[PDB]
Design a protein around this ligand. Structure first.
Ligand code: MG
Ligand code: MG
Ligand code: MG
Ligand code: MG
Ligand code: MG
Ligand code: MG
Length: 327
DNA sequence: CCGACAGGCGCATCAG
DNA sequence: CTGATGCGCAT
DNA sequence: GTCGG
């Protein structure tokens, strides 16, 4: 498919190994950073030296690229692919709620297959049990046509609960993607600000309404501001059912919507890059605020923010529309 | 060369 | 029980 | 694994 697709596939597979098997989060991030910068690079890479000029690509990745270019493979990966333990741990982490730690522990206890998981429900926590239940469905992508039907349901049902709610579909959907891995919904209500919560159960009431109409089907986790769960579009007579889909809802302080929507629009790599750039500039950005850093690494008071662009301006970045925050 | 690497919610668990 | 910590997850 | 001080 893609211009340096071989290289970026290699690097992403190395990232996953470092995260899932090595449990080295900074090496995972370093590989993902390199994969992203190479994926955006508009030339077919001819050497590692050429790749090394990109920020995030260093000596070790440049050497892997030289290997890959010459031979069409990487020995280091060819050996990870035949390592039984690595391969089993990597597979189990595909279940939502099983991470590197739980996968290694399962693999040590003799559980390394889907079949093994499916006769050991009792060793799984609630999240894992649901991740297993919908293992196949959760790896299917959601065409934009279906994302549009799902937006319509969520926005109309939210409006039924209280007309003052605003629900914004974020993630890859807001970035214009033709398909999405899941549905991300940012929610606000005027009664929840950074200064005051003057209504309880604001997130709960929306979740309950979506359960009532059979859109939300399962709950992975749920607190006062974050819901993680499962939903499904209604199917019509004699049609196969739609796959079950992952849904995330985040209730954000209304007056902090712009930091909220910046966060929830991503991409994840974009947010890391942006937040890392903020730190270089003497600021810290989360889903609520952008704050200056003081001398001794302590965060100051929130800066006024009136648009997404305001946050970009503070770190002296030219604005990027959501569609230009992908990959 | 070597600190630092994005930020935080919800859940599960440990020490007391 | 609270407070701390790690895990898995979200972008 | 990479990079800025
Ligand atoms: Mg470089
Ligand atoms: Mg997993
Ligand atoms: Mg998403
Ligand atoms: Mg994602
Ligand atoms: Mg999501
Ligand atoms: Mg059904």
């Amino acid at each position: 498919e893609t211009l340096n697709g071989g290289i970026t596939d290699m690097l992403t597979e190395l990232a996953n190994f470092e995260k899932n098997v090595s449990q080295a989060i900074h090496k995972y991030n370093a590989y993902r950073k390199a994969a992203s910068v190479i994926a955006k690079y508009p030339h077919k890479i001819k050497s590692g030296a050429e790749a090394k000029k990109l920020p995030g690509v260093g000596t070790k990745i440049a050497e892997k690229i030289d290997e890959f270019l010459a031979t069409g493979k990487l020995r280091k990966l060819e050996k990870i692919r035949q390592d039984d333990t690595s391969s089993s741990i990597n597979f189990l982490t595909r279940v939502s709620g099983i991470g590197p730690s739980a996968a290694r522990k399962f693999v040590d206890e003799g559980i390394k297959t889907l079949e093994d998981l499916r006769k050991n429900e009792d060793k799984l926590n609630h999240h894992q049990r649901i991740g297993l239940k919908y293992f196949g469905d959760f790896e299917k992508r959601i065409p934009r046509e279906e994302m549009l039907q799902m937006q319509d349901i969520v926005l109309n049902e939210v409006k039924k609960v209280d007309s003052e709610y605003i629900a914004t579909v974020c993630g890859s959907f807001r970035r214009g993607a033709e398909s999405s891995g899941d549905m991300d919904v940012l929610l606000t209500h005027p009664s929840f600000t950074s200064e005051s919560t003057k209504q309880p159960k604001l997130l709960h009431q929306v979740v309950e309404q979506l359960q009532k109409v059979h859109f939300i089907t399962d709950t992975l986790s749920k607190g006062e501001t974050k819901f993680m769960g499962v939903c499904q579009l209604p199917s019509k007579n004699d049609e196969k059912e739609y796959p079950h889909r992952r849904i995330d809802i985040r209730l954000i302080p209304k007056d902090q919507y712009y930091c909220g929507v910046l966060y929830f629009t991503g991409s994840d790599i974009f947010n890391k890059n942006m937040r890392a750039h903020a730190l270089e500039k003497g600021f810290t950005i989360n889903e609520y605020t952008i704050r200056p850093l003081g001398v001794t690494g302590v965060a100051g008071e929130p800066l006024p923010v009136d648009s997404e662009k305001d946050i970009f301006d503070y770190i002296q970045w030219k604005y990027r529309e959501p569609k230009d925050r992908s990959e």
